Design a protein around this ligand. Structure first.
Ligand SMILES: [Mg+2]
Lengths: 490, 252, 208, 287, 241
């Protein structure tokens, strides 16, 4: 493992080197008591109930939430981020080695960082019962969740809890009640669900995909739950609000992200599929599509809608960063939102940091500099950042593939069921939900129907959404690219 | 890399070789001509004897560090160090040398040992040190003459003086022997030659030569011509030494 | 203090007469002395001891700069060391640069002095060496670091005496002015006071 | 100057104490002296002192045009100097025989045994390659050098780190120790010599001889070895008549000795890394 | 190219245990007190021994107990195909000098010529492998021609290791391959080694083999040399009367 890891990180150019000495120097010495000199421009919310939700076993916890009731029936919601900009001030070498490392890779076992573990899990993170710096976005809302008054304030806070999703859910609806956390969590999951169904009505689409995260006795599949959708909805609202603000204030230089909607020449496969399975679909826009996927259900295939959701996700284009000046698209297919920019996770992204800076200067809590307005340099770094996110995706995929190879080596499982997604002349793509895996199988005399996508052999016929059992044999002839192989049975 | 001199560049070639031109040729002149000579003995102070000679672009010093303790076995010695300053000649050469300096040193020693009488300087080595500040033609001959002057000045005994003369050959169709030439007449030449003699007793002391070509009769004519040149040059050196002795008489 | 933690150690080596490892900050020099010993008729001189210094770094070979520096040290030692007592013999001072972090001479001189002491060689007076760096703004710094020497426009190594705190040696890099010379010299005198106190502490604890 | 002559008293006493298998300080014949490995602040410096013999070792790098016969792999330049502080007789340009034999032996031992990877340190095949030189300096001379010189060269070449370099086509980019973390070398196996001294034409043999024992010995057998029992060099000097079984036995000794020295060296490097990973510019190991 | 064909043969056409025909002579140069010549294949060494004579510039080195051996080495420029310069003064010829000196000071039995130089000189005209041993043997023949007492033919040769076998009297090809080569010089009568040089990596258990192989090769060289010497002595005596 300790060789293949470095090999994929050298091939995808993902820099793995440790942090140089110059970088470490610009860091703060680590006696770190909250300095009440920098706290001038900021405020004090230590008198607040906060409960940062966090997946199993994490250390770069950055976000934090709260939902404080207000006398007027309204309530003030508030998200809080680690205000890394103060530590990461521009012109340094830190900034360069964090830019090149334009994102933190999270492989199946380790994680290549963008800022040292010190500044990533001991200072910036919102650890429990420790006063930490922060940016904060606060809204006032009612029990129908329509914004009424906003604010974007720097501050210092104190997370009273660093919970887990399961711990979160049980604290929410285990019948326990306390003036500290559970009431906030409940009254916040409520607004979460309201916003969620409201934005679903707004046209934003939901999807799914085969995702397996290894421990590796036996692999497991990610499980959905309220808390995740909750935090996601709140973070999306925060991103959108921040984006609107930094756009209204800056209309030339900025960092936004778009999702160029797909040409309709890609949906035709899914259309033909659901047509051969007599489920009608409207691929003219995002809404039509989404509001259709919720109807394409049929009892014969309880596990059907998910397949179409994948078959769709195989079509969407790449969501990419860019600058507000050099382009004018400002439209995000996926969420149906016109503008969206990442703001939550700077420990995990650099565009988040640049957004912190732009937003802070719009607030007046920072000083400008030439490399903040020079569209050329900003576009170049944005291109770098996109390249880097792409490399990271590719690398993580290669890693999960390696772990599947290793698991099949340890356990030679054979003849597990599988459904079908595509149908091609030479091969017949297949999907296994158990192991969360999609694969190919060659057949190298056939009958290839393209008007209706199907295959015909003298004995049988292959259409999408059929079933076949398969035997997975991994070939290691070339130790480079030890590759899976499917054999078919019925 | 030499660790007794300053760290310079590894290699360094001059600009001339990167030039583009046909250098000027001298042309014609009186073959039996001699350049204007300035010879003075007694220049240097810290040396028992010194001499300076200038003939055209030629500029040579010679000093004599006198007897320094160090029959036919208790017979004197004289060791000569010829040395051309690195700022002489179109090209630069590191101070050490080791190819032609030593050849010309052997020449000086072979041309001086005869004149000097070393029976009267036993158990002793005379350190002769020549220095060529600028090359402008006949060099080894000027060095012989200057070393002779410096010795005669320091007051070492002798039998007669040493007079040198350098010759070259014109590569033209009618090759004539060119007397006391210039660095141009010497680099655009076919053959070169150097005589050195003791004119009173009419005896050669050390000669030398080389040729893109030649022949017995030509070399013989060259020899006699160089002899005549040295004869015609001798009186200058005589007067120079007399003058230095008069200055000594004046000092006290 | 105005200058940095600096220590020494005596009688390290068994074979040489007297030895001294003198380090300050991160520069560390090691000196070994061969006391009055033999000398050939060419190197010697009646009524004086021939003092010969040989300094050698830890990289490459010794060239010219090291020869100049060892001449400086040679003549300084001839200034303090008594040599009309031990004529027709040779004192030899070997210097090795374990480390180089600026203030080199300011370390070699101190080590040479401590070695001469350990070898019980008759000296007229201790001596010391300091180094003062003038940056562009004129703000001087004593016992500099290589960063401070590179980022500066002048550097000045002063070899002082103990009896009357005079100037035995001065080696300068860069270009400077008069007043700066005078003021850095005064600061050097103060630093030399401190260095002499240190010598006394070390020898007090050595004879105990 | 000159070395003080050796009295017949000491000579006879030593020969007798050997006959009776008694060393001077109090150790046996098959034993070294307490060897200490101390490190410096700069990656590549090591002072190794066995008993009274101290030797310094520095390792430096450069980039240079390689030599045509080997345009792929780099270069390596040994040099050992015998500083006048080692002993009086070590005037410059006088004790040349000892220099020559030591330097040839060390070159042979390390270079031709292929201890490091002269290939890994290539950057531009034909134009620019590394050049690693190692300067050993003898500070105190009490007895055994070759062992000390070798331990020093090895501790250095295992405690040295190059300025990292990036390359694309012909574009070469060097960087500073502050911009990136220097990269170490590539060793395959660490050889370290072992010195045996013969007394009375071959009858008696000692290990790690002191200076006197080197003055009353007739022959010297150097043997280079690894922790994997791989002869790299062996040399006989002093004009002495030995046999086969003697070299066989000496080799079976060098095996264990080198295993132990190697364990120590590795422990030293581990401790030095631990220190620098905690604040501190030194590292110390004791036999 | 190859070194050991699977059959057992080499490139030159000789098995591992044998060597190349040495062709020698004693009495090349008469202006000396002892001279020799040897060609141990393509190699061509040439030795000279200016006998035990007076020290000049005494410079206080004339040992009063024994004699003073001064052996000089030299490898001509045109020896190897690759021309080189500075054959003397190099850091390798001087090591060879030390080696030859400590061998012959062991053998040459100096206790009978106190305060006297025995000047040995060696020039290598052609080198094709085994460049030290040829010189040892030529200097031996020289010493003998100079009637200098000496304990025994100090016979030398080289061995190597390839494919788990031992080769005798290497050439340049297998000397350039980098494999272990062990050169030595011993005194046959007693079975004692006067010199043992060696340069490359190899295991320990593979030592006795190459060691005894080099020894046996040196014994064979002894046979050849002594036959030469006996022819020489016989012819000389016959001519005397
Ligand atoms: Mg969270």
């Amino acid at each position: 493992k300790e060789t293949e890891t470095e090999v994929l990180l050298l091939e995808h150019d993902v820099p793995h080197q440790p942090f140089s000495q110059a970088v470490l120097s610009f860091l703060p010495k680590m006696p770190w008591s909250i300095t009440e000199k920098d706290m001038k421009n900021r405020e004090d919310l230590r008198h607040l109930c906060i409960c940062s939700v966090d997946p199993p076993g994490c250390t770069d916890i950055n976000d934090a939430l709260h939902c404080r009731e207000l006398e007027n029936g309204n309530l003030e919601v508030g998200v809080h981020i680690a205000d890394v900009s103060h530590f990461i001030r521009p012109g340094n070498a830190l900034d360069q080695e964090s830019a090149r490392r334009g994102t933190t890779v999270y492989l199946c076992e380790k994680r290549i960082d963008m800022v040292p573990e010190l500044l990533s899990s001991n200072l910036c993170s919102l650890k429990c019962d420790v006063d930490r710096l922060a940016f904060s976005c606060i809204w006032e809302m009612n029990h129908n969740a329509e914004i009424l008054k906003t604010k974007f304030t720097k501050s210092v806070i104190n997370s009273k809890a660093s919970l887990t999703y399961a711990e979160a859910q049980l604290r929410i609806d285990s019948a326990n009640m306390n003036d500290d956390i559970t009431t906030s969590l409940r009254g916040l999951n409520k607004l979460a669900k309201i916003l969620k169904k409201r934005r679903i009505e707004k046209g934003a689409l939901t999807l799914s995909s085969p995702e397996v995260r290894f421990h590796p006795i036996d692999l497991q599949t990610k499980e959905l739950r309220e808390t995740n959708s909750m935090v996601e909805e709140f973070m999306l609202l925060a991103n959108i609000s921040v984006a609107k603000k930094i756009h209204e204030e800056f209309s030339e230089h900025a960092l936004l992200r778009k999702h160029p909607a797909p040409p309709p020449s890609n949906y035709e496969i899914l259309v033909k599929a659901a047509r051969s399975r007599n489920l009608e679909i409207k691929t003219d826009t995002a809404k039509s599509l989404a509001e259709s996927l919720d109807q394409a259900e049929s009892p014969t295939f309880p596990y059907l809608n998910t397949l179409l959701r994948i078959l769709a996700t195989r079509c969407m284009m790449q969501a990419v960063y860019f600058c507000s000046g050099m382009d004018n698209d400002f439209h995000h297919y996926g969420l149906a939102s016109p503008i969206y920019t990442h703001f939550t996770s700077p420990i995990r992204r650099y565009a988040d940091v640049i957004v912190h800076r732009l937003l802070a200067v719009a607030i007046g809590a920072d000083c400008t500099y030439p490399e903040l307005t020079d569209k050329h340099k900003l576009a170049d770094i944005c291109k770098n950042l996109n390249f880097r996110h792409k490399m990271a995706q590719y690398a993580q995929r290669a890693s999960v593939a390696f772990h599947t190879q290793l698991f099949f080596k340890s356990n030679g499982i054979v003849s597990e069921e599988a459904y079908i997604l595509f149908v091609r002349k030479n091969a017949i793509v297949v999907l296994i939900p158990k192991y969360g895996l999609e694969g190919t199988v060659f057949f190298e005399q056939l009958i290839y129907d393209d008007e209706i996508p199907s295959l015909k052999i003298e004995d049988t016929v292959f259409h999408v959404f059929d079933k076949v059992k398969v035997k997975i044999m991994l070939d290691s002839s070339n130790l480079q690219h030890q590759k899976i192989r499917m054999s078919l049975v019925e | 890399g030499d660790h007794r001199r300053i760290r310079g560049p590894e290699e360094s070639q001059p600009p001339q070789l990167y030039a583009a031109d046909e250098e000027e040729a001298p042309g014609t002149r009186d073959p039996t001509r001699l350049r204007p000579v300035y010879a003075r003995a007694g220049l240097l102070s810290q040396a028992k004897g010194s001499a300076y000679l200038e003939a055209g672009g030629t500029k040579v010093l010679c000093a004599v560090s006198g007897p320094r303790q160090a029959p036919a076995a208790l017979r004197g010695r004289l060791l000569c160090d010829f040395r051309r300053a690195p700022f002489a000649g179109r090209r630069r050469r590191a101070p050490p040398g080791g190819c032609e300096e030593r050849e010309l040193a052997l020449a000086l020693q072979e041309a001086l040992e005869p004149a000097v009488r070393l029976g009267r300087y036993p158990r002793a080595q005379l350190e002769v040190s020549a220095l060529l500040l600028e090359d402008g033609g006949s060099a080894l001959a000027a060095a012989l003459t200057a070393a002779a002057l410096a010795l005669a000045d320091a007051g070492v005994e002798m039998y007669d003086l040493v007079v040198g003369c350098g010759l070259s050959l014109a590569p033209g169709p009618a090759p004539t022997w060119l007397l006391d030439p210039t660095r141009l007449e010497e680099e655009r030449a076919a053959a070169g030659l150097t005589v050195a003699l003791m004119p009173v007793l009419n005896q050669v002391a050390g000669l030398l030569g080389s040729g893109e070509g030649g022949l017995t009769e030509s070399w013989a004519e060259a020899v006699r011509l160089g002899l005549e040149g040295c004869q015609r040059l001798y009186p200058v050196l005589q007067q120079s030494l007399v003058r230095a002795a008069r200055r000594r008489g004046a000092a006290a | 203090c105005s200058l940095r933690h600096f220590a020494c150690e005596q009688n390290l080596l068994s074979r040489p007469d007297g030895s001294a490892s003198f380090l300050q900050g991160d520069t560390s020099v090691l000196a070994g002395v061969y006391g009055p010993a033999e000398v050939k008729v060419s190197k010697e001189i009646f009524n004086k001891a021939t003092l010969e210094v040989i300094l050698r770094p830890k990289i490459g070979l010794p060239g010219v700069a090291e020869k100049s520096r060892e001449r400086l040290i040679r003549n300084t030692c001839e200034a303090v060391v008594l040599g009309t007592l031990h004529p027709r013999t040779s004192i030899t001072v070997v210097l090795q640069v374990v480390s180089d972090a600026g203030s080199l001479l300011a370390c070699c001189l101190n080590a040479a002095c401590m070695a001469l002491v350990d070898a019980g060689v008759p000296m007229r007076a201790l001596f010391c060496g300091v180094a003062c760096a003038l940056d562009s703004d004129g703000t001087l710094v004593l016992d500099p670091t290589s960063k401070q020497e590179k980022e500066a426009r002048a550097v000045l190594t002063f070899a002082l005496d103990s009896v009357e705190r005079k100037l035995l040696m001065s080696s300068t890099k860069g270009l400077y002015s008069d007043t700066e010379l005078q003021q850095c010299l005064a600061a050097a005198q103060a630093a030399s006071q401190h260095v002499f106190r240190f010598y006394r502490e070390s020898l007090q604890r050595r004879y105990s | 100057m000159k070395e003080t002559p050796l009295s017949n008293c000491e000579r006879r006493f030593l020969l007798r104490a050997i006959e009776e298998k008694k060393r001077l300080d109090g150790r046996q014949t098959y034993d070294y002296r307490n060897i200490r490995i101390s490190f410096g602040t700069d990656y590549g410096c090591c002072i190794v002192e066995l008993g009274k013999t101290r030797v310094l070792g520095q390792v430096s790098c450069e980039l240079v045009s390689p030599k045509l016969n080997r345009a792929t792999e780099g270069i390596l330049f040994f040099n050992l100097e015998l500083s006048q502080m080692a002993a009086p007789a070590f005037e410059p340009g006088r004790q040349s025989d000892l220099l020559v034999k030591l330097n040839r032996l060390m070159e042979r031992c390390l270079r031709n045994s292929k201890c490091i990877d002269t290939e890994s340190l290539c950057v531009v095949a034909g134009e620019k390659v590394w050049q690693i030189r190692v300067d050993l300096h003898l500070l105190n001379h009490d007895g055994n050098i070759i062992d000390a010189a070798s331990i020093a060269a090895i501790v250095a070449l295992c405690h040295f780190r190059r300025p990292d370099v990036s390359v694309q086509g012909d574009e070469v980019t060097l960087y500073t120790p502050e911009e990136r973390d220097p990269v170490p070398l590539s060793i395959h196996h660490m050889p370290i010599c072992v010195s045996f001294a013969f007394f009375q034409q071959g009858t008696y043999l000692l290990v790690d001889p002191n200076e006197r024992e080197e003055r009353v010995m007739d022959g010297l057998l150097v043997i280079a070895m690894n922790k994997h029992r791989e002869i790299c060099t062996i040399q006989s000097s002093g004009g002495i008549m030995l046999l086969k079984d003697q070299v066989l036995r000496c080799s079976k000794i060098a095996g264990v000795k080198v295993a132990e020295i190697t364990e120590l060296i590795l422990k030293a490097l581990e401790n030095d890394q631990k220190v620098r990973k905690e604040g501190g510019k030194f590292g110390f190991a004791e036999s | 190219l190859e070194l050991l064909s699977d059959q057992g043969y080499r490139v030159d056409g000789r098995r591992a245990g044998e060597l190349r025909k040495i062709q020698a002579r004693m009495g090349v140069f008469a202006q000396a007190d002892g001279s020799a010549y040897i060609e141990q294949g393509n190699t061509k060494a040439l030795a000279v021994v200016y006998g035990p004579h007076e020290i000049r510039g005494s410079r206080a080195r004339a040992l009063p107990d024994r004699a003073l051996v001064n052996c000089q080495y030299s490898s001509a420029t045109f020896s190897t195909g690759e021309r080189k310069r500075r054959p003397h003064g190099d850091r390798k010829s001087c090591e060879m000098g030390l080696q030859l000196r400590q061998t012959f000071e062991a053998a040459i039995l100096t206790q009978l010529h106190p305060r006297s130089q025995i000047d040995i000189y060696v020039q290598v005209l052609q080198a094709d492998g085994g460049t030290y041993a040829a010189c040892v043997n030529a200097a031996t023949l020289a010493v003998l021609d100079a009637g200098i007492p000496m304990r025994d033919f100090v016979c030398a040769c080289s061995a190597g290791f390839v494919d788990g076998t031992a080769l005798a009297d290497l050439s340049h090809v297998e000397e350039a391959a980098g494999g272990p080569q062990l050169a030595l010089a011993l005194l046959p009568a007693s079975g004692q080694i006067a010199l043992l040089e060696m340069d490359a990596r190899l295991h320990e258990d593979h030592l006795e083999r190459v060691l005894e192989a080099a020894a046996q090769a040196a014994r064979d060289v002894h046979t050849l040399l002594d036959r030469v010497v006996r022819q020489h002595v016989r012819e000389a005596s016959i001519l005397l009367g």
